[PDB]
Amino acid sequence: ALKAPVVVLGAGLASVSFVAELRQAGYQGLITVVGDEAERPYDRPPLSKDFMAHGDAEKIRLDCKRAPEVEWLLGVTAQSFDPQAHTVALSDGRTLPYGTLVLATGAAPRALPTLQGATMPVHTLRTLEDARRIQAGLRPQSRLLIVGGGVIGLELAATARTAGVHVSLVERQPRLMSRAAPATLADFVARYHAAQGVDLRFERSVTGSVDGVVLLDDGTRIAADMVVVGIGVLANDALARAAGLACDDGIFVDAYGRTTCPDVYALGDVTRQRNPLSGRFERIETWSNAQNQGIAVARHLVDPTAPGYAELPWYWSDQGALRIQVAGLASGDEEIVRGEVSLDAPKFTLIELQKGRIVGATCVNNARDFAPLRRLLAVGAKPDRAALADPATDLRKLAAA
Amino acid sequence: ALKAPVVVLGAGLASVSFVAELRQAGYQGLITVVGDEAERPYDRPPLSKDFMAHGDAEKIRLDCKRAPEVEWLLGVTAQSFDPQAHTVALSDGRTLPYGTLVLATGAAPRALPTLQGATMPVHTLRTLEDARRIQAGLRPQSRLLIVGGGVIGLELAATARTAGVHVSLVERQPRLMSRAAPATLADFVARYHAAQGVDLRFERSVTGSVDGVVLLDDGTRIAADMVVVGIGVLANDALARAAGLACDDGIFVDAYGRTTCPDVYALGDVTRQRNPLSGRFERIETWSNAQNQGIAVARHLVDPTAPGYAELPWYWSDQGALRIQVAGLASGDEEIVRGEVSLDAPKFTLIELQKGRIVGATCVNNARDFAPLRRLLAVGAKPDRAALADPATDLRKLAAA
Numbered sequence: 146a147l148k149a150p151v152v153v154l155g156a157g158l159a160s161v162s163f164v165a166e167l168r169q170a171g172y173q174g175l176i177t178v179v180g181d182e183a184e185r186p187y188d189r190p191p192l193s194k195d196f197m198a199h200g201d202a203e204k205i206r207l208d209c210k211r212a213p214e215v216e217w218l219l220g221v222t223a224q225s226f227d228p229q230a231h232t233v234a235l236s237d238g239r240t241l242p243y244g245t246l247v248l249a250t251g252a253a254p255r256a257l258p259t260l261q262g263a264t265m266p267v268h269t270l271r272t273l274e275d276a277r278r279i280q281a282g283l284r285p286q287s288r289l290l291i292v293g294g295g296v297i298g299l300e301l302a303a304t305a306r307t308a309g310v311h312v313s314l315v316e317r318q319p320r321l322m323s324r325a326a327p328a329t330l331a332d333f334v335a336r337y338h339a340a341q342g343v344d345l346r347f348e349r350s351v352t353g354s355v356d357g358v359v360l361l362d363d364g365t366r367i368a369a370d371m372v373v374v375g376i377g378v379l380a381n382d383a384l385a386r387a388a389g390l391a392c393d394d395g396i397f398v399d400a401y402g403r404t405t406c407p408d409v410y411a412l413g414d415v416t417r418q419r420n421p422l423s424g425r426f427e428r429i430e431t432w433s434n435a436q437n438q439g440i441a442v443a444r445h446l447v448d449p450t451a452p453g454y455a456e457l458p459w460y461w462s463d464q465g466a467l468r469i470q471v472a473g474l475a476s477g478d479e480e481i482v483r484g485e486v487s488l489d490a491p492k493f494t495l496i497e498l499q500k501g502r503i504v505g506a507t508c509v510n511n512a513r514d515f516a517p518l519r520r521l522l523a524v525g526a527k528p529d530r531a532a533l534a535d536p537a538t539d540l541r542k543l544a545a546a
Numbered sequence: 547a548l549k550a551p552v553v554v555l556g557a558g559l560a561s562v563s564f565v566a567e568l569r570q571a572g573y574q575g576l577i578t579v580v581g582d583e584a585e586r587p588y589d590r591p592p593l594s595k596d597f598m599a600h601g602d603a604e605k606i607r608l609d610c611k612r613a614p615e616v617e618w619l620l621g622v623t624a625q626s627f628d629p630q631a632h633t634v635a636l637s638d639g640r641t642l643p644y645g646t647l648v649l650a651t652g653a654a655p656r657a658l659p660t661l662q663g664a665t666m667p668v669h670t671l672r673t674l675e676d677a678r679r680i681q682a683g684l685r686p687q688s689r690l691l692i693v694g695g696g697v698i699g700l701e702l703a704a705t706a707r708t709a710g711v712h713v714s715l716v717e718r719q720p721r722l723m724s725r726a727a728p729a730t731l732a733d734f735v736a737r738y739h740a741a742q743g744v745d746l747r748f749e750r751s752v753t754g755s756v757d758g759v760v761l762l763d764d765g766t767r768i769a770a771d772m773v774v775v776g777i778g779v780l781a782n783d784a785l786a787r788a789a790g791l792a793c794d795d796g797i798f799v800d801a802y803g804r805t806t807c808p809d810v811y812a813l814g815d816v817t818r819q820r821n822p823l824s825g826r827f828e829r830i831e832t833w834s835n836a837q838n839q840g841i842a843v844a845r846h847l848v849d850p851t852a853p854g855y856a857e858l859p860w861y862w863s864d865q866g867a868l869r870i871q872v873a874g875l876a877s878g879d880e881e882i883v884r885g886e887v888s889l890d891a892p893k894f895t896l897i898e899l900q901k902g903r904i905v906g907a908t909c910v911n912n913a914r915d916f917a918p919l920r921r922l923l924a925v926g927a928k929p930d931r932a933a934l935a936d937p938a939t940d941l942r943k944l945a946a947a
């Protein structure tokens with residue numbers, strides 16, 4: 146079952162979390178990790194946050210010490226694997242044998258087809274190399290155009306504004322954060338960014354560019370010194386597709402991390418997996434999934450009596466003055482608003498319910514509320530809804546009971 | 547790999563096709579099939595066609611003779627399987643061991659929530675028992691309401707009209723056959739059914755029923771003696787879900803039929819699988835998939851050097867005077883129309899193209915054209931488009947080259 150040796154493809158958070166848990170759970174056989182980036186394994190959330198602002202990569206490295214006795218092959222690309230021969234072919238000419246193969250190859254930013262032939266700087270933001278490149282161009286008083294109103298684009302928008310960069314942002318949807326964020330939150334976030342000087346353009350798409358100017362589908366133009374594209378990511382599932390695994394913008398896995406190919410597992414951003422709240426398959430794109438799924442899959446490989454992955458989804462986003470936390474589903478049949486929604490010292494909580502049951506929550510500048518809410522969410526709590534609204538209620542108390 | 551004994555759950559077309567191919571390919575070990583219906587294995591397409599009209603079940607049985615030495619446990623339900631112990635638990639108290647388990651459990655009609663408490667006859671049409679029940683109520687001059695404008699509902703509509711039954715039909719979409727049928731075809735099919743006296747209601751939904759009358763979301767009413775619901779099907783994937791396989795209204799499989807659980811395969815209507823034309827996962831609901839996927843999975847189990855399943859999708863529908871055949875994708879960036887689209891002796895061909903490449907085709911009352919078109923489709927042919935339109939063109943000739 147858990148057959149030595151273990152080979153992991155990818156050296157990001159999911160991989161690091163997985164191999165650390167293998168060691169902690171007691172597996173003592175060979176572990177080899179293949180990572181295409183020639184970088185000490187590092188975390189991505191700082192790249193649109195404090196790193197973008199302060200530039201010290203030695204503050205963003207992952208801790209690989211709970212993963213002793215691991216050989217990390219950095220700067221090397223896995224080119225294919227043969228699931229019958231149980232081997233992986235590497236770009237440096239070597240071949241690795243495996244008893245258990247783990248695909249943890251993440252996802253890459255989608256390119257914008259209309260900017261393919263652009264003759265102005267166009268970047269995406271995924272890697273440390275990307276961040277360094279973008280930061281090198283965030284000159285004060287320059288003009289940045291961001292395509293996409295997802296959390297990363299908005300984090301970059303805030304960082305750029307703090308650095309004195311003019312920011313315009315184009316979003317095809319009528320709201321920001323259309324993926325997994327309640328409308329109430331998205332509306333407020335737009336007001337916040339607008340108030341900080343971001344030039345927001347909703348229901349607009351990029352049709353092209355000419356000589357340093359981007360063209361939109363309303364027949365208008367936006368001049369910029371740099372474009373950063375952030376319209377989402379695509380799973381890095383090429384090796385899986387070529388080897389005959391079930392994939393569709395993401396490798397399908399069950400709660401044990403199993404792919405359709407025996408002895409091959411997958412975890413993190415590369416997977417398409419069950420969301421336990423919706424009961425539907427989804428490609429989750431969060432830090433917490435990468436870590437939690439990696440840990441759960443490793444734990445069950447070492448101890449098959451352990452449960453499969455069962456964590457509920459959540460993420461956070463740091464956008465200037467807004468410390469945003471979102472858990473569960475973006476909507477149900479009811480939203481309860483705790484506190485006032487205001488640009489004057491923003492601080493509020495949203496709770497999403499379905500037939501009385503909590504299915505999602507949001508905290509803006511209230512980390513203290515978020516932990517109790519995630520606990521209530523996990524057990525599908527059906528609390529008194531006036532109390533949920535009633536500011537006099539302590540959520541931590543509710544959760545303890 | 548192909549490990550004896552083989553157990554198949556479900557005794558429909560996919561199962562029969564699979565076990566026949568196992569035998570033909572040379573596998574001589576045990577095969578046991580568990581089928582919940584107490585019926586000699588039978589084909590479903592006649593149920594809304596000639597069977598609905600003539601009632602002889604001995605004309606619709608599947609041929610199990612290319613499947614010698616198979617024990618068919620008819621009238622028995624598989625209640626669970628234990629993929630670690632490699633056993634299946636049966637409703638009759640017995641347990642079957644397996645080396646290879648194959649899930650071929652099909653799909654069941656979706657119920658209409660708004661008719662849950664109905665006090666008038668409400669039926670769905672999937673089984674021989676369903677067909678016999680519906681036919682028993684198709685009294686001449688009675689009123690039938692069909693909910694759903696899919697092919698089965700339309701086949702029943704035509705059959706009922708031929709039998710002198712008044713037919714009304716309610717469809718939530720603005721067109722019939724919204725799944726995998728070109729708009730040009732759907733528009734024509736509506737004209738045909740309207741001309742035959744079907745009372746079609748588009749962009750309407752059922753909100754409820756009271757004392758023999760169905761309520762619609764435009765505030766109106768339709769009286770009927772019987773309702774037949776045909777709004778689609780849901781995969782019978784409960785055993786797979788309970789055992790920890792990856793599922794989402796369908797068991798995920800690769801081109802070898804492998805699920806995420808080692809030694810467990812799935813085929814037919816129960817699977818969610820790659821459509822090679824769209825490159826996306828889809829639950830295919832066709833006779834040709836059930837047979838073709840069953841054969842391909844069996845072939846590769848016996849001979850692992852054989853390719854995985856690779857057939858392109860297609861189906862047919864018999865609706866009164868219309869013999870409809872549809873292959874591939876419903877749309878591309880171009881449609882070519884061969885012949886005139888007319889209610890006077892209907893006979894035409896549609897061809898769908900994407901950047902010059904054939905990606906779909908339709909034939910109405912022209913079986914001769916359909917075979918060559920499927921061949922051109924399979925090789926992604928890029929023929930001269932005037933010739934494709936030019937009535938002087940022989941498609942069979944084009945395909946041979």
Ligand SMILES: Cc1cc2nc3c(=O)[nH]c(=O)nc-3n(C[C@H](O)[C@H](O)[C@H](O)COP(=O)(O)OP(=O)(O)OC[C@H]3O[C@@H](n4cnc5c(N)ncnc54)[C@H](O)[C@@H]3O)c2cc1C
Nearest residue numbers: 155157158159181189190223250251413414430431432460
């Ligand atoms: C700028 C940014 C900000 C983010 N902010 C947040 C946040 O605040 N909160 C949050 O919840 N999430 C955030 N995320 C998301 C989060 O970081 C991801 O969910 C996480 O990185 C996924 O980890 P992973 O290990 O699955 O994939 P990855 O981090 O992508 O790691 C995969 C690695 O495998 C490599 N690889 C791919 N193919 C091969 C191959 N053939 N051979 C060898 N190596 C290969 C990749 O290049 C990559 O290094 C952010 C992401 C970015 C980019």
Ligand SMILES: Cc1cc2nc3c(=O)[nH]c(=O)nc-3n(C[C@H](O)[C@H](O)[C@H](O)COP(=O)(O)OP(=O)(O)OC[C@H]3O[C@@H](n4cnc5c(N)ncnc54)[C@H](O)[C@@H]3O)c2cc1C
Nearest residue numbers: 556558559560582590591624651652814815831832833861
């Ligand atoms: C009325 C009708 C008309 C159709 N017309 C056409 C057509 O003209 N053209 C076309 O392309 N397709 C048509 N189809 C579709 C086609 O018949 C299906 O695609 C095909 O039946 C799928 O075969 P299957 O073996 O995968 O599933 P099924 O035929 O559903 O067989 C599965 C069997 O497994 C049984 N089962 C489920 N769970 C268990 C269990 N736990 N234990 C034991 N047994 C179980 C089921 O009850 C069922 O008997 C039609 C279908 C219907 C119903």
